[PDB]
Design a protein around this motif. Structure first.
Motif, PDB file in Angstrom:
ATOM      1  N   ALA A   1       0.838  -1.192   0.000  1.00 12.99           N
ATOM      2  CA  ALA A   1       0.000   0.000   0.000  1.00 12.99           C
ATOM      3  C   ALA A   1       0.862   1.226   0.000  1.00 12.99           C
ATOM      4  CB  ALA A   1      -0.941   0.031   1.209  1.00 12.99           C
ATOM      5  N   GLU A   2       2.008   1.183   0.659  1.00 13.20           N
ATOM      6  CA  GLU A   2       2.851   2.364   0.599  1.00 13.20           C
ATOM      7  C   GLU A   2       3.506   2.439  -0.808  1.00 13.20           C
ATOM      8  OE1 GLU A   2       5.146   3.435   4.367  1.00 13.20           O
ATOM      9  OE2 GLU A   2       5.039   1.261   4.656  1.00 13.20           O
ATOM     10  N   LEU A   3       3.880   1.303  -1.387  1.00 12.41           N
ATOM     11  CA  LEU A   3       4.482   1.333  -2.713  1.00 12.41           C
ATOM     12  C   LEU A   3       3.433   1.868  -3.726  1.00 12.41           C
ATOM     13  CD1 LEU A   3       6.374   0.663  -5.054  1.00 12.41           C
ATOM     14  CD2 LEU A   3       5.956  -1.726  -4.712  1.00 12.41           C
ATOM     15  N   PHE A   4       2.196   1.383  -3.649  1.00 11.11           N
ATOM     16  CA  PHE A   4       1.166   1.831  -4.544  1.00 11.11           C
ATOM     17  C   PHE A   4       0.811   3.295  -4.392  1.00 11.11           C
ATOM     18  CE2 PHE A   4      -0.295  -2.869  -4.481  1.00 11.11           C
ATOM     19  CZ  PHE A   4       0.686  -3.169  -5.429  1.00 11.11           C
ATOM     20  N   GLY A   5       0.894   3.834  -3.175  1.00 11.86           N
ATOM     21  CA  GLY A   5       0.583   5.241  -2.991  1.00 11.86           C
ATOM     22  C   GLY A   5       1.683   6.076  -3.577  1.00 11.86           C
ATOM     23  N   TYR A   6       2.859   5.477  -3.671  1.00 14.01           N
ATOM     24  CA  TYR A   6       3.999   6.174  -4.272  1.00 14.01           C
ATOM     25  C   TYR A   6       3.836   6.192  -5.812  1.00 14.01           C
ATOM     26  CZ  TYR A   6       8.742   6.845  -6.196  1.00 14.01           C
ATOM     27  OH  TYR A   6       9.794   7.251  -7.010  1.00 14.01           O
TER      28      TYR A   6
END
Ligand SMILES: CC(C)=CCC/C(C)=C/CC/C(C)=C/CSP(=O)(O)OP(=O)(O)O
Ligand SMILES: CC(C)=CCC/C(C)=C/CC/C(C)=C/CSP(=O)(O)OP(=O)(O)O
Ligand SMILES: [Mg+2]
Ligand SMILES: [Mg+2]
Ligand SMILES: [Mg+2]
Length: 284
Positions: A124-129
Motif C-alpha cells: 500500500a505504501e508502494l502503490f501510494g507512491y
C-alpha cells in the motif's frame, strides 16, 4: 516559426532526449495534442530531475512557484523563475485546457520526499507512491487525451500511469539498487525471502523471480483493465495510448528474456515499436 512554436519545440527536444520509450509513441498524436504533451512532459521531467539530476532544491521550489503563478493568473505575463520556455508552453496549454494543478503539486511533493527515501513497509505504501509519481501525470494528461473529462477517465488515466510506474520499477530494479533504492516492499520482500543486495551480487534465483513475477502479474492485470476502457480517450489518442502501454508490456517480456538481469537496462527497439503500432492499428 513564432516564439511560442519555439517554446514547444524546446519541450519536444527535452522529451526526445529523456523518453526513449514514449517520445516515439506520443509524437504520433495530432499537432495540438502532442504539443501539449511535450509541455507536460518537459514540466514533469524538470521536476523529476530538479533534485535527482541537478541536486537543486531551490530550482524545484521555483518550478512550484511558476506553476502556482499560472494557476492563479492564467492570463498575466509572468517572469518565470525556473525554465521560461517550458512555463510559457505550460501557461499556453492552461489557457485552452483544464490543468489539474493539484496533480503537479502531488508530484512535486512525492519527488521531494524521495530525498528521505525510506523503504516501503507494505505494498500500500508502494502503490501510494506510484500514484504520486505517475498516477498524477495520468491526471494531468486527462484533459488533453480526452473530450470527456469525467471520473471514469481520470480513473483509467491514473490507473494506467500507476501501472506503468510498476513496470518501470520492474525494469529498473538493478539500477535502482545501485542508487540505493529498492521499491519492493519489506512485507513482500520478507515473504518471498529476498535481499536485493544479495541477488544483485550473486545473480537471479527462483525466489527473486517469483517476487518479480508477483508484481508483473499485478501490472499486467491492471494493464488489461485499462485496455478494456481505452475508449474513455479521444479516438485519435486511443491507438497512441495503447501503443504507450504495450511498449511497456513489451519491456516486461524483455526483462524475462534477459533472465531478469539486474545488470543491464532492457529497452524496446524503435523498429519493434513501429511493429506494435501496426498491430494495434490492425484492430483500429
Ligand atoms: C497516458 C495516460 C492516460 C497515462 C500514463 C501516464 C504516464 C505516461 C506516466 C508515466 C509513467 C512512467 C514511469 C514513465 C516513464 S517516463 P521516461 O521518459 O523516463 O520513460 P523511459 O524511462 O525512457 O521508459
Ligand atoms: C511520458 C509522460 C507523458 C510523462 C512522464 C513525465 C515524467 C518524466 C515524470 C517524472 C516522474 C518519472 C516517471 C520519472 C522517470 S522514472 P525512470 O525510472 O525512467 O527514471 P528517469 O528519471 O527517467 O532516469
Ligand atoms: Mg526514464
Ligand atoms: Mg528520475
Ligand atoms: Mg526507474
Amino acid at each position: 516559426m513564432t516564439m511560442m512554436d519555439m517554446n514547444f519545440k524546446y519541450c519536444h527536444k527535452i522529451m526526445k532526449k529523456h523518453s526513449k520509450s514514449f517520445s516515439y509513441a506520443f509524437d504520433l498524436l495530432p499537432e495540438d495534442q502532442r504539443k501539449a504533451v511535450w509541455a507536460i512532459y518537459a514540466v514533469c521531467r524538470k521536476i523529476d530531475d530538479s533534485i535527482d539530476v541537478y541536486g537543486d532544491i531551490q530550482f524545484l521550489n521555483q518550478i512550484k512557484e511558476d506553476i502556482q503563478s499560472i494557476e492563479k493568473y492564467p492570463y498575466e505575463y509572468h517572469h518565470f523563475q525556473s525554465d521560461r520556455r517550458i512555463m510559457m508552453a505550460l501557461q499556453h496549454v492552461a489557457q485552452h485546457k483544464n490543468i489539474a494543478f493539484q496533480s503537479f503539486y502531488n508530484l512535486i511533493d512525492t519527488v521531494y520526499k524521495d530525498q528521505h527515501f525510506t523503504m516501503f513497509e507494505t505494498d500500500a505504501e508502494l502503490f501510494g507512491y506510484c500514484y504520486g509519481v505517475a498516477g498524477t501525470v495520468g491526471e494531468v494528461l486527462t484533459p488533453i487525451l480526452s473530450d470527456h473529462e469525467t471520473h471514469q477517465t481520470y480513473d483509467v488515466a491514473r490507473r494506467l500511469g500507476e501501472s506503468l510506474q510498476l513496470i518501470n520499477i520492474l525494469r529498473d530494479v538493478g539500477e535502482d539498487f545501485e542508487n540505493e533504492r529498492i521499491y519492493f516492499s519489506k512485507q513482500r520482500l520478507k515473504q518471498y525471502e529476498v535481499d536485493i543486495a544479495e541477488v544483485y551480487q550473486n545473480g537471479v534465483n527462483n525466489h527473486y523471480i517469483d517476487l518479480w513475477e508477483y508484481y508483473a502479474a499485478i501490472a499486467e492485470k491492471d494493464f488489461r483493465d485499462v485496455m478494456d476502457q481505452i475508449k474513455v480517450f479521444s479516438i485519435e489518442a486511443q491507438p497512441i495510448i495503447e501503443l504507450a502501454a504495450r511498449i511497456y508490456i513489451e519491456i516486461l517480456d524483455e526483462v524475462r528474456q534477459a533472465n531478469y538481469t539486474l545488470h543491464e537496462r532492457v529497452f524496446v527497439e524503435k523498429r519493434k515499436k513501429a511493429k506494435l503500432f501496426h498491430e494495434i492499428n490492425s484492430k483500429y
